[PDB]
Design a protein around this ligand. Structure first.
Ligand SMILES: [Cl-]
Ligand SMILES: [Cl-]
Ligand SMILES: [Cl-]
Ligand SMILES: [Mg+2]
Ligand SMILES: [Mg+2]
Ligand SMILES: [Rb+]
Ligand SMILES: [Rb+]
Ligand SMILES: [Rb+]
Ligand SMILES: [Rb+]
Ligand SMILES: [Rb+]
Ligand SMILES: [Rb+]
Length: 136
RNA sequence: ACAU
DNA sequence: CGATGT
């Protein structure tokens, strides 16, 4: 139960669930924001958490970085491990964008390799993840 | 129950 | 209190 400070932390934020979804990744040690996705009009918490991890994998791979990724989402960690986002969200015209991004993230996982450890952020011991959106 |  | 997920 030691934080690995040399890591990337990601989190989703939303207005509603389902609702408007965004996500970001930060340097765990410094809090510096390294990437932020423009808000998506309709998605779920778990789809955003999944996209955040996959974006982190792509970000670190492009920069030849072996740092681990922290996420507080038990669901999204499993989905990334499985390379499959098992979302219940309806696929229709309103949800087309989030589903396109999820499909593309799965596609990336199936066509690329990575060694990045994907670690559970232990909120119960460490407080809220550094990438959190102070919204609850 | 657990994580969000 | 409501939701998404294992
Ligand atoms: Cl994305
Ligand atoms: Cl590690
Ligand atoms: Cl986990
Ligand atoms: Mg989270
Ligand atoms: Mg959060
Ligand atoms: Rb590379
Ligand atoms: Rb929050
Ligand atoms: Rb929060
Ligand atoms: Rb949390
Ligand atoms: Rb809760
Ligand atoms: Rb539940």
């Amino acid at each position: 139960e030691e934080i690995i400070w040399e890591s990337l932390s990601v989190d989703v934020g939303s207005q509603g669930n389902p609702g408007i979804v965004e996500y970001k990744g930060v340097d765990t040690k410094t809090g510096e924001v390294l990437f932020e996705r423009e808000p998506i009009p309709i998605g779920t918490n778990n789809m955003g958490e999944f996209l955040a991890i996959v974006h982190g994998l792509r970000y670190l791979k492009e920069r030849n970085s072996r740092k681990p990724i922290y996420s507080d989402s038990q669901t999204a960690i499993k989905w990334v491990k499985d390379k499959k986002a098992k979302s219940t969200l309806v696929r229709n015209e309103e949800t087309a964008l989030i589903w396109k991004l999820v499909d593309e993230a799965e596609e990336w996982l199936n066509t690329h390799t990575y060694e990045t450890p994907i670690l559970k952020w232990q909120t119960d011991k460490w407080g809220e993840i550094k990438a959190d959106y102070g919204r609850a």
